[PDB]
Amino acid sequence: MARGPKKHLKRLAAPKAWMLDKLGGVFAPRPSTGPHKLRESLPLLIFLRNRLKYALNGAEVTKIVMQRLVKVDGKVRTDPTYPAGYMDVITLEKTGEFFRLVYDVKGRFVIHRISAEEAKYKLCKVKKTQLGAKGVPFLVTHDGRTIRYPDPLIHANDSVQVDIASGKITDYIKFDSGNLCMITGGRNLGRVGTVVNRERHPGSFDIVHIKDSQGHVFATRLTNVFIIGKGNKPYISLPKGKGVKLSIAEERDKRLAAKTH
Amino acid sequence: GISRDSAHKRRATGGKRKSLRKKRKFELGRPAANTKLGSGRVHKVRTRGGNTKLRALRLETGNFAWASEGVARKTRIADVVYNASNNELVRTKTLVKNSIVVIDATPFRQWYEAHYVLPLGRKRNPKHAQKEDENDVLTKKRSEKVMKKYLERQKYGKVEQALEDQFTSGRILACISSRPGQCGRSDGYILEGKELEFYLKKIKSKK
Amino acid sequence: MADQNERAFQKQFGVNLNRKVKPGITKKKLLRRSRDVGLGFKTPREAIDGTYIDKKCPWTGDVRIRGRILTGVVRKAKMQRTIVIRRDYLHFVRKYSRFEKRHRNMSVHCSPVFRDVEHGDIVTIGECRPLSKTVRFNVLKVSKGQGAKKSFKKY
RNA sequence: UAGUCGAUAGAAUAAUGUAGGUAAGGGAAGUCGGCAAAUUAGAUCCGUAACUUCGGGAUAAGGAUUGGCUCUGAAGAUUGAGAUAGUCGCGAUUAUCAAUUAACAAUCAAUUCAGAACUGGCACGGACUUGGGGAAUCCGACU
RNA sequence: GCCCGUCGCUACUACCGAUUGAAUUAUUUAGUGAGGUCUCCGGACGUGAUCACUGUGACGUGUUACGGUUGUUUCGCAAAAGUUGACCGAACUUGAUUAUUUAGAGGAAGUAAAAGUCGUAACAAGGUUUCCGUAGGUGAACCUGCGGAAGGAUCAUUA
RNA sequence: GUAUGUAAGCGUAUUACCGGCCGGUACUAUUACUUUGAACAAAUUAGAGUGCUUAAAGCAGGCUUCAAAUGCCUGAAUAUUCUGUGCAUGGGAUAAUGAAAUAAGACCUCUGUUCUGCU
RNA sequence: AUUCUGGUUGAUCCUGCCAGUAGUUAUAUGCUUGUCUCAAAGAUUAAGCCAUGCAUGUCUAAGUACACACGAAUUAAAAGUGAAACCGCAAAAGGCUCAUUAUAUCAGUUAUGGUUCCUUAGAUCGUUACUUGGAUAACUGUGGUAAUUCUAGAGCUAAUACAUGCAAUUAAAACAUGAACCUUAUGGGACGUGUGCUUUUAUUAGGCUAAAACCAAGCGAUCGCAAGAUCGUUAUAUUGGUUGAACUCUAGAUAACAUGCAGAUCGUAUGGUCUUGUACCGACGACAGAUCUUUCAAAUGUCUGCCCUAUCAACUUUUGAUGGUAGUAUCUAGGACUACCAUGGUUGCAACGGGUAACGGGGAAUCAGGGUUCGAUUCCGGAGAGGGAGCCUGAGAAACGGCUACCAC
């Protein structure tokens, strides 16, 4: 009821995974209220300007996105403050780069170039399935898309392939404990594979215990666990090195090693 | 003005709660509708988020339900008999949640003559005969059917003794279970088994 | 207790027993459905047998007991359908490199399903839909009520 | 009720009186001096100091309220019911038992104390009864 | 040799204290109470639908429709000033209360004291060992009385 | 030849299934404490990566290459302070608590005995 | 960097504080001060008071243009662009300050079956004017008070304002109760009102281990010419549901309810097909819109924690104190409020009260560590806007760079 929303987001109060540089600006781009939650969402303003370097300023981002060149999941996206978070396909039609926003092992978004046929779909984790609104059951995804009349075997925390051109379900992977996963924030964020087991604690905070392909085992809450696949074959193209999470020192050894200049 | 907030009025330690917040509109409360017995007025109130919740002032009519028979009909609210919360409410004839209401009973009864052909209480030779449409409903015939349906019904048809007294007297005990101050309508449970037995003691003691 | 005799006729929302028209009868005389308290918490069987209205009861009422599960000791049984518990614990203050033993005294609703609730009972309480100012809890299990000697009746 | 109506009366009913009252606005300026006069007063409720010999001060101070009518509750006395059996014609006669029990119920008594409406033009101790109060000082302890 | 207080000068500080001082603050009884809102009304006004009188058309003078800053009789929906009863209640007045500040005749301390006046109190048994509790008296110190201790001047000897 | 610290055996709480010792299920004295997990806002604090020309620190920028060129690219970690607490988990030491000696004591089992009670 | 050093004396050793001594994003002040980068900064006291200026206004192809503002010319041209004004949305907070305020705020920890959510993202509306009606701004003209401004009066004219409500506004279908028909009823029905989403009430289906011997209406089969009498293999006694569940949960049936919705929009761009009615039917997204989710949120509630003080020990219950019950209020639980009914609730584990240069936390300072101190301020949350109270709008303000009032200025 009370107060806000209050539309002004200060830089430094701004989610760190974006990598906004402190200086030059007191004020953060504040993704408008869309399908993706404000901390988990990569504004079009940061993605075009800071990463892709097509835009120098905020004034340049509104010029490009007004031109309707940034067509996030089947939609023109006129708004430069549009949130566009997880599994979202950003297609810069001229010249053609085709992106999915997926997560770095450092819990940051990546610039990830996907095939133009991979760009057709996307993977949606299902929040909730409820019965009553037209034409009688409906399924709602984490990207707020409601897909009417879901297959009756689709249960909460499953993933669906969405055709995007039409809003249809055209695959579903049951939450079963050897399915390939990418975890979305806890601290374990974009680490990958393969969910050994869940331990259900009734009311609440069901913990999923996950074993990566380095055989390292780690744990996150079920709300953070997104199912993307089958053990071995992920349905979408993962960013390099496949969220394995070494240590920073082991990465330092590999990095230092990799140059003869 | 009128304010919810737990933060007024002495702690359980008796500690003096100082101030902190003027009165906020977050805490808002608003003057009671105090809905009277009479001519059908309903007013919209803008309630937080947007939504109209209806304050009824002056409601004649309600939806009073026979739970046992699973049928509710629209009947005039004749009177307010009792109120457990305040005796002043009875006098002013304000329609409240669980205010005891005496109905009107006439459309209920016509249909239960038309489900059982058992006149519920046992009426009278000119009263049955005089069909507006009493006697026509009773006799019916068509050979055959609807008479056959009355044969099927009635191991159940005896109708509770308390209810039969109330039925022909034309005034039936009920409790309104709606807030016509926020729900804009005055609608009730018709007192059946246990519901009558506690209230009937209260009627004859209080009067 | 009382024969639920208050100025109002005590009824639970949505249960009127239907005598008239709907398929007959196998005994019990009561349409009272009763709970499984389920964080493996077992029901007292007086819930199912309870004439008592209590709308603030999870067993007979439309309420969730939502959230924090805490164990404490009843200090005062005095109130009709509520009890006081004192919980006493060590809070370690690093500065004083020792604790202070500290208390919180909190009122918690005893549904009248729970019988022989007496000071000093160990009781499992759940945070409730916050029920009447100092009463911010409801009893989910009386884990004591007890009398480790008294359970089997002394000669 | 019993006893009076005799206090010489009538008419006028002046001043001045006596005895009884009232007076705007201001409110002790009056005077030797608040003298005289007025305020106050009963009851119930709330609240209650300096000081103190702890008993008082105290009706401290300071506040609220009071009719009528119409209801309601509380506060007592006394036996009786209920159930069963036998005999004679519901009536009469005989036998049994403790619980029942806070009005058990029933009936009789006689007013007290409380609460709620309605109600009148603030009218409500309405007549009458009936402390003005507080702060100090001098003096004798006190009646 | 040490040396203290009384007494007196001066300077400074805080206390008690007639005034039942003064000031400000937050709670508080009672009374008074703006305004808003809710709510009982009100009808400044303005139309419908119906009726007429006139004009016109249609229909069998009448009726119906339309127009005429039109008039009038039914009965509706909106509706201002004002306004009823309620609840919130700023604010004010007067008692009570609390915290905080500060005037003050005068009394009565201590201090800086440093050139003073009067004594020798204690420091050696300080010429009366010291010193405590407590009372009274001495200008004061202190003395004295009663019971003490040793921090004594006896760590003791002395059938 | 030791050593046994590590592993498995054997003596009223590792008993019992199902599916092929494993992994569930059925599981079990309360706590304080303690163990390991998640859950710990950024800045700060410590500090990684990096010549902000030094540096405070910024979070830049370096590279084949000042060729031709988005081509190759590492990045803006990790910890702790946001304590205690709470959540979840392990231990059974330490300090308390626990039946049952006026035994309606603990199991189990026999009364179809009893009461509740059914698709 | 776990550090001392000077000072009681004739000399000497401790007790001791004092001084020296070092640091302080920790403030002041002096003197001196060429250059570089960086920047706290009317907090403390006066959360005092304020002249003058400014910080909150807003238009696209896209609600409404008959601005002669510009553009007009050739065909009916208005259309274009777009100030004004209507309409819609913002103004609820950025910013500032930290007073009140000590479990309060708040952090961490969490809940919401205790609730609201514009917006955005995504989906949803086949139960006789089809594009109508008239009044007002802007405008035009005339005015008012010394005035900001507030507007009076007269005369126009728009709508994604308003008022209605059809030709895709459509009923059918099936189920209820009405019933033509038939027959004994394992039983079913033409045609009908009613049956859209919603709002509002009540009731219910809801979370269901396996078999038999009988009886009444007989479903197959059998026995009997019949009349009659037996038996029986099987589907099946079947909304789920978060899960502390008899949730009114996302949703429905039966019986009743009230009343919103379903576009008389606009801009892009016009096609198919002529019987060319200027017919029929058609894409996108802007703004509505109803149900539902999501998102920005939010209010309340859990656990645990805060300085000094006993020269504050009992405290809360006049009038909710603390509990029951029922109501009322509200967005919601709720003594928040009120009747009635109980006598509770809090306390040496320091309650109640008083004080605080006392917002809280994240944090900062100073260190051997342990701590001690700090925080008014660069963030987060909350609070307030002279002190207080009340209110409208709107998804949201008990708003002050809104209003209305009082008191003080």
mmCIF file of all heavy atoms in Angstrom, chain G residues 190-201:
data_model
loop_
_atom_site.group_PDB
_atom_site.id
_atom_site.type_symbol
_atom_site.label_atom_id
_atom_site.label_comp_id
_atom_site.label_asym_id
_atom_site.label_seq_id
_atom_site.Cartn_x
_atom_site.Cartn_y
_atom_site.Cartn_z
ATOM 1 P P A G 190 -33.767 -33.496 -24.769
ATOM 2 O OP1 A G 190 -32.664 -34.198 -25.453
ATOM 3 O OP2 A G 190 -33.391 -32.814 -23.528
ATOM 4 O "O5'" A G 190 -34.410 -32.374 -25.740
ATOM 5 C "C5'" A G 190 -34.472 -32.675 -27.163
ATOM 6 C "C4'" A G 190 -35.889 -32.531 -27.724
ATOM 7 O "O4'" A G 190 -36.940 -33.190 -26.997
ATOM 8 C "C3'" A G 190 -36.474 -31.127 -27.919
ATOM 9 O "O3'" A G 190 -35.663 -30.466 -28.891
ATOM 10 C "C2'" A G 190 -37.905 -31.485 -28.304
ATOM 11 O "O2'" A G 190 -38.005 -31.956 -29.619
ATOM 12 C "C1'" A G 190 -38.311 -32.683 -27.357
ATOM 13 N N9 A G 190 -39.007 -32.319 -26.131
ATOM 14 C C8 A G 190 -38.641 -32.581 -24.836
ATOM 15 N N7 A G 190 -39.477 -32.112 -23.945
ATOM 16 C C5 A G 190 -40.466 -31.504 -24.709
ATOM 17 C C6 A G 190 -41.656 -30.830 -24.364
ATOM 18 N N6 A G 190 -42.078 -30.660 -23.105
ATOM 19 N N1 A G 190 -42.410 -30.338 -25.371
ATOM 20 C C2 A G 190 -41.997 -30.522 -26.630
ATOM 21 N N3 A G 190 -40.910 -31.145 -27.081
ATOM 22 C C4 A G 190 -40.180 -31.617 -26.055
ATOM 23 P P C G 191 -36.020 -29.112 -29.669
ATOM 24 O OP1 C G 191 -36.541 -29.462 -31.015
ATOM 25 O OP2 C G 191 -34.875 -28.176 -29.543
ATOM 26 O "O5'" C G 191 -37.224 -28.573 -28.781
ATOM 27 C "C5'" C G 191 -38.144 -27.581 -29.269
ATOM 28 C "C4'" C G 191 -38.568 -26.723 -28.105
ATOM 29 O "O4'" C G 191 -39.097 -27.563 -27.055
ATOM 30 C "C3'" C G 191 -37.500 -25.862 -27.438
ATOM 31 O "O3'" C G 191 -37.015 -24.574 -27.886
ATOM 32 C "C2'" C G 191 -38.017 -25.690 -26.013
ATOM 33 O "O2'" C G 191 -38.856 -24.564 -25.856
ATOM 34 C "C1'" C G 191 -38.808 -26.984 -25.801
ATOM 35 N N1 C G 191 -38.247 -28.016 -24.910
ATOM 36 C C2 C G 191 -38.896 -28.251 -23.694
ATOM 37 O O2 C G 191 -39.907 -27.588 -23.415
ATOM 38 N N3 C G 191 -38.408 -29.191 -22.854
ATOM 39 C C4 C G 191 -37.318 -29.884 -23.189
ATOM 40 N N4 C G 191 -36.873 -30.802 -22.327
ATOM 41 C C5 C G 191 -36.636 -29.666 -24.422
ATOM 42 C C6 C G 191 -37.131 -28.731 -25.245
ATOM 43 P P G G 192 -35.553 -23.915 -27.562
ATOM 44 O OP1 G G 192 -35.385 -22.641 -28.307
ATOM 45 O OP2 G G 192 -34.495 -24.957 -27.609
ATOM 46 O "O5'" G G 192 -35.975 -23.618 -26.034
ATOM 47 C "C5'" G G 192 -37.059 -22.634 -25.839
ATOM 48 C "C4'" G G 192 -37.671 -22.422 -24.428
ATOM 49 O "O4'" G G 192 -38.476 -23.570 -23.965
ATOM 50 C "C3'" G G 192 -36.830 -22.088 -23.221
ATOM 51 O "O3'" G G 192 -36.983 -20.792 -23.864
ATOM 52 C "C2'" G G 192 -37.821 -22.322 -22.077
ATOM 53 O "O2'" G G 192 -38.749 -21.269 -21.917
ATOM 54 C "C1'" G G 192 -38.531 -23.605 -22.523
ATOM 55 N N9 G G 192 -37.766 -24.762 -22.059
ATOM 56 C C8 G G 192 -37.118 -25.641 -22.891
ATOM 57 N N7 G G 192 -36.500 -26.596 -22.252
ATOM 58 C C5 G G 192 -36.753 -26.336 -20.912
ATOM 59 C C6 G G 192 -36.339 -27.037 -19.752
ATOM 60 O O6 G G 192 -35.645 -28.059 -19.677
ATOM 61 N N1 G G 192 -36.816 -26.436 -18.593
ATOM 62 C C2 G G 192 -37.592 -25.306 -18.552
ATOM 63 N N2 G G 192 -37.950 -24.884 -17.330
ATOM 64 N N3 G G 192 -37.988 -24.638 -19.630
ATOM 65 C C4 G G 192 -37.534 -25.208 -20.770
ATOM 66 P P U G 193 -36.144 -19.422 -23.942
ATOM 67 O OP1 U G 193 -36.877 -18.331 -24.636
ATOM 68 O OP2 U G 193 -34.704 -19.638 -24.233
ATOM 69 O "O5'" U G 193 -36.506 -19.552 -22.414
ATOM 70 C "C5'" U G 193 -35.931 -18.774 -21.431
ATOM 71 C "C4'" U G 193 -36.803 -18.382 -20.287
ATOM 72 O "O4'" U G 193 -37.435 -19.520 -19.687
ATOM 73 C "C3'" U G 193 -35.750 -17.826 -19.379
ATOM 74 O "O3'" U G 193 -35.411 -16.469 -19.613
ATOM 75 C "C2'" U G 193 -35.848 -18.701 -18.112
ATOM 76 O "O2'" U G 193 -36.482 -18.050 -17.030
ATOM 77 C "C1'" U G 193 -36.676 -19.925 -18.572
ATOM 78 N N1 U G 193 -35.951 -21.153 -18.995
ATOM 79 C C2 U G 193 -35.623 -22.089 -18.035
ATOM 80 O O2 U G 193 -35.900 -21.954 -16.856
ATOM 81 N N3 U G 193 -34.956 -23.192 -18.509
ATOM 82 C C4 U G 193 -34.589 -23.454 -19.815
ATOM 83 O O4 U G 193 -33.991 -24.495 -20.083
ATOM 84 C C5 U G 193 -34.963 -22.442 -20.748
ATOM 85 C C6 U G 193 -35.611 -21.359 -20.321
ATOM 86 P P G G 194 -33.860 -16.195 -19.647
ATOM 87 O OP1 G G 194 -33.663 -14.727 -19.539
ATOM 88 O OP2 G G 194 -33.302 -16.923 -20.815
ATOM 89 O "O5'" G G 194 -33.269 -16.864 -18.339
ATOM 90 C "C5'" G G 194 -33.572 -16.416 -17.041
ATOM 91 C "C4'" G G 194 -32.799 -17.309 -16.068
ATOM 92 O "O4'" G G 194 -33.329 -18.659 -16.136
ATOM 93 C "C3'" G G 194 -31.318 -17.532 -16.463
ATOM 94 O "O3'" G G 194 -30.522 -16.405 -16.122
ATOM 95 C "C2'" G G 194 -30.997 -18.807 -15.728
ATOM 96 O "O2'" G G 194 -30.854 -18.603 -14.337
ATOM 97 C "C1'" G G 194 -32.224 -19.630 -15.963
ATOM 98 N N9 G G 194 -32.114 -20.557 -17.082
ATOM 99 C C8 G G 194 -32.650 -20.384 -18.329
ATOM 100 N N7 G G 194 -32.346 -21.345 -19.154
ATOM 101 C C5 G G 194 -31.583 -22.220 -18.394
ATOM 102 C C6 G G 194 -30.949 -23.432 -18.750
ATOM 103 O O6 G G 194 -30.954 -24.018 -19.847
ATOM 104 N N1 G G 194 -30.238 -23.972 -17.681
ATOM 105 C C2 G G 194 -30.140 -23.416 -16.448
ATOM 106 N N2 G G 194 -29.385 -24.067 -15.580
ATOM 107 N N3 G G 194 -30.738 -22.300 -16.094
ATOM 108 C C4 G G 194 -31.434 -21.756 -17.112
ATOM 109 P P U G 195 -29.275 -16.094 -17.059
ATOM 110 O OP1 U G 195 -28.775 -14.758 -16.702
ATOM 111 O OP2 U G 195 -29.679 -16.350 -18.488
ATOM 112 O "O5'" U G 195 -28.169 -17.154 -16.674
ATOM 113 C "C5'" U G 195 -27.628 -17.448 -15.407
ATOM 114 C "C4'" U G 195 -26.862 -18.767 -15.447
ATOM 115 O "O4'" U G 195 -27.792 -19.864 -15.816
ATOM 116 C "C3'" U G 195 -25.798 -18.815 -16.554
ATOM 117 O "O3'" U G 195 -24.564 -18.192 -16.198
ATOM 118 C "C2'" U G 195 -25.668 -20.318 -16.735
ATOM 119 O "O2'" U G 195 -24.904 -20.887 -15.683
ATOM 120 C "C1'" U G 195 -27.094 -20.761 -16.674
ATOM 121 N N1 U G 195 -27.746 -20.990 -17.963
ATOM 122 C C2 U G 195 -27.380 -22.110 -18.672
ATOM 123 O O2 U G 195 -26.555 -22.905 -18.265
ATOM 124 N N3 U G 195 -28.015 -22.265 -19.873
ATOM 125 C C4 U G 195 -28.954 -21.424 -20.423
ATOM 126 O O4 U G 195 -29.423 -21.689 -21.522
ATOM 127 C C5 U G 195 -29.282 -20.287 -19.627
ATOM 128 C C6 U G 195 -28.681 -20.113 -18.450
ATOM 129 P P G G 196 -24.235 -16.727 -16.609
ATOM 130 O OP1 G G 196 -24.480 -15.873 -15.416
ATOM 131 O OP2 G G 196 -24.970 -16.383 -17.853
ATOM 132 O "O5'" G G 196 -22.686 -16.806 -16.917
ATOM 133 C "C5'" G G 196 -22.191 -17.894 -17.734
ATOM 134 C "C4'" G G 196 -21.223 -17.228 -18.710
ATOM 135 O "O4'" G G 196 -21.889 -16.181 -19.487
ATOM 136 C "C3'" G G 196 -20.097 -16.463 -17.988
ATOM 137 O "O3'" G G 196 -19.111 -17.409 -17.549
ATOM 138 C "C2'" G G 196 -19.653 -15.588 -19.130
ATOM 139 O "O2'" G G 196 -18.929 -16.252 -20.112
ATOM 140 C "C1'" G G 196 -20.879 -15.074 -19.697
ATOM 141 N N9 G G 196 -21.468 -13.827 -19.228
ATOM 142 C C8 G G 196 -22.748 -13.660 -18.775
ATOM 143 N N7 G G 196 -22.990 -12.448 -18.364
ATOM 144 C C5 G G 196 -21.802 -11.767 -18.586
ATOM 145 C C6 G G 196 -21.448 -10.426 -18.314
ATOM 146 O O6 G G 196 -22.149 -9.521 -17.827
ATOM 147 N N1 G G 196 -20.122 -10.167 -18.651
ATOM 148 C C2 G G 196 -19.256 -11.075 -19.167
ATOM 149 N N2 G G 196 -18.028 -10.640 -19.386
ATOM 150 N N3 G G 196 -19.572 -12.321 -19.443
ATOM 151 C C4 G G 196 -20.853 -12.597 -19.124
ATOM 152 P P C G 197 -18.896 -17.639 -15.986
ATOM 153 O OP1 C G 197 -18.322 -18.981 -15.745
ATOM 154 O OP2 C G 197 -20.161 -17.315 -15.290
ATOM 155 O "O5'" C G 197 -17.860 -16.534 -15.602
ATOM 156 C "C5'" C G 197 -16.464 -16.789 -15.793
ATOM 157 C "C4'" C G 197 -15.792 -15.408 -15.816
ATOM 158 O "O4'" C G 197 -16.341 -14.579 -16.863
ATOM 159 C "C3'" C G 197 -15.877 -14.577 -14.598
ATOM 160 O "O3'" C G 197 -14.984 -15.036 -13.618
ATOM 161 C "C2'" C G 197 -15.496 -13.211 -15.191
ATOM 162 O "O2'" C G 197 -14.123 -13.115 -15.532
ATOM 163 C "C1'" C G 197 -16.378 -13.071 -16.364
ATOM 164 N N1 C G 197 -17.751 -12.622 -16.120
ATOM 165 C C2 C G 197 -17.927 -11.335 -15.721
ATOM 166 O O2 C G 197 -16.917 -10.599 -15.664
ATOM 167 N N3 C G 197 -19.171 -10.893 -15.403
ATOM 168 C C4 C G 197 -20.222 -11.723 -15.507
ATOM 169 N N4 C G 197 -21.439 -11.225 -15.197
ATOM 170 C C5 C G 197 -20.069 -13.071 -15.930
ATOM 171 C C6 C G 197 -18.824 -13.476 -16.244
ATOM 172 P P U G 198 -15.472 -15.388 -12.133
ATOM 173 O OP1 U G 198 -14.348 -16.139 -11.518
ATOM 174 O OP2 U G 198 -16.788 -16.039 -12.211
ATOM 175 O "O5'" U G 198 -15.619 -13.966 -11.427
ATOM 176 C "C5'" U G 198 -14.642 -12.959 -11.595
ATOM 177 C "C4'" U G 198 -15.296 -11.575 -11.536
ATOM 178 O "O4'" U G 198 -16.296 -11.436 -12.555
ATOM 179 C "C3'" U G 198 -16.078 -11.201 -10.295
ATOM 180 O "O3'" U G 198 -15.176 -10.816 -9.281
ATOM 181 C "C2'" U G 198 -17.016 -10.117 -10.745
ATOM 182 O "O2'" U G 198 -16.337 -8.906 -10.959
ATOM 183 C "C1'" U G 198 -17.447 -10.668 -12.102
ATOM 184 N N1 U G 198 -18.662 -11.481 -12.067
ATOM 185 C C2 U G 198 -19.835 -10.857 -11.710
ATOM 186 O O2 U G 198 -19.895 -9.674 -11.436
ATOM 187 N N3 U G 198 -20.936 -11.669 -11.685
ATOM 188 C C4 U G 198 -20.973 -13.014 -11.969
ATOM 189 O O4 U G 198 -22.038 -13.613 -11.886
ATOM 190 C C5 U G 198 -19.719 -13.587 -12.335
ATOM 191 C C6 U G 198 -18.631 -12.818 -12.371
ATOM 192 P P U G 199 -15.154 -11.425 -7.840
ATOM 193 O OP1 U G 199 -13.731 -11.461 -7.462
ATOM 194 O OP2 U G 199 -15.885 -12.707 -7.816
ATOM 195 O "O5'" U G 199 -15.905 -10.379 -6.961
ATOM 196 C "C5'" U G 199 -15.902 -8.978 -7.186
ATOM 197 C "C4'" U G 199 -17.284 -8.390 -6.843
ATOM 198 O "O4'" U G 199 -18.250 -8.713 -7.844
ATOM 199 C "C3'" U G 199 -17.943 -8.945 -5.569
ATOM 200 O "O3'" U G 199 -17.371 -8.317 -4.415
ATOM 201 C "C2'" U G 199 -19.373 -8.615 -5.797
ATOM 202 O "O2'" U G 199 -19.717 -7.288 -5.486
ATOM 203 C "C1'" U G 199 -19.527 -8.983 -7.168
ATOM 204 N N1 U G 199 -20.103 -10.271 -7.554
ATOM 205 C C2 U G 199 -21.395 -10.532 -7.158
ATOM 206 O O2 U G 199 -22.061 -9.742 -6.519
ATOM 207 N N3 U G 199 -21.877 -11.755 -7.539
ATOM 208 C C4 U G 199 -21.205 -12.720 -8.254
ATOM 209 O O4 U G 199 -21.767 -13.777 -8.506
ATOM 210 C C5 U G 199 -19.874 -12.371 -8.630
ATOM 211 C C6 U G 199 -19.380 -11.184 -8.276
ATOM 212 P P U G 200 -16.797 -9.199 -3.221
ATOM 213 O OP1 U G 200 -16.221 -8.274 -2.219
ATOM 214 O OP2 U G 200 -15.928 -10.252 -3.740
ATOM 215 O "O5'" U G 200 -18.162 -9.776 -2.680
ATOM 216 C "C5'" U G 200 -18.859 -8.955 -1.747
ATOM 217 C "C4'" U G 200 -20.211 -9.529 -1.515
ATOM 218 O "O4'" U G 200 -20.969 -9.732 -2.748
ATOM 219 C "C3'" U G 200 -20.268 -10.959 -0.906
ATOM 220 O "O3'" U G 200 -19.893 -10.919 0.510
ATOM 221 C "C2'" U G 200 -21.702 -11.354 -1.162
ATOM 222 O "O2'" U G 200 -22.592 -10.707 -0.271
ATOM 223 C "C1'" U G 200 -21.900 -10.848 -2.697
ATOM 224 N N1 U G 200 -21.692 -11.995 -3.579
ATOM 225 C C2 U G 200 -22.741 -12.870 -3.743
ATOM 226 O O2 U G 200 -23.817 -12.717 -3.198
ATOM 227 N N3 U G 200 -22.483 -13.930 -4.570
ATOM 228 C C4 U G 200 -21.305 -14.195 -5.226
ATOM 229 O O4 U G 200 -21.220 -15.198 -5.922
ATOM 230 C C5 U G 200 -20.266 -13.242 -5.007
ATOM 231 C C6 U G 200 -20.491 -12.197 -4.210
ATOM 232 P P U G 201 -19.190 -12.211 1.077
ATOM 233 O OP1 U G 201 -18.567 -11.909 2.361
ATOM 234 O OP2 U G 201 -18.300 -12.789 0.043
ATOM 235 O "O5'" U G 201 -20.359 -13.226 1.304
ATOM 236 C "C5'" U G 201 -21.251 -12.872 2.367
ATOM 237 C "C4'" U G 201 -22.558 -13.724 2.258
ATOM 238 O "O4'" U G 201 -23.257 -13.586 1.020
ATOM 239 C "C3'" U G 201 -22.386 -15.267 2.416
ATOM 240 O "O3'" U G 201 -22.231 -15.644 3.776
ATOM 241 C "C2'" U G 201 -23.741 -15.720 1.893
ATOM 242 O "O2'" U G 201 -24.809 -15.560 2.810
ATOM 243 C "C1'" U G 201 -23.910 -14.920 0.722
ATOM 244 N N1 U G 201 -23.440 -15.528 -0.522
ATOM 245 C C2 U G 201 -24.297 -16.381 -1.177
ATOM 246 O O2 U G 201 -25.412 -16.636 -0.767
ATOM 247 N N3 U G 201 -23.798 -16.927 -2.328
ATOM 248 C C4 U G 201 -22.554 -16.710 -2.871
ATOM 249 O O4 U G 201 -22.243 -17.287 -3.905
ATOM 250 C C5 U G 201 -21.726 -15.811 -2.135
ATOM 251 C C6 U G 201 -22.187 -15.262 -1.013
#
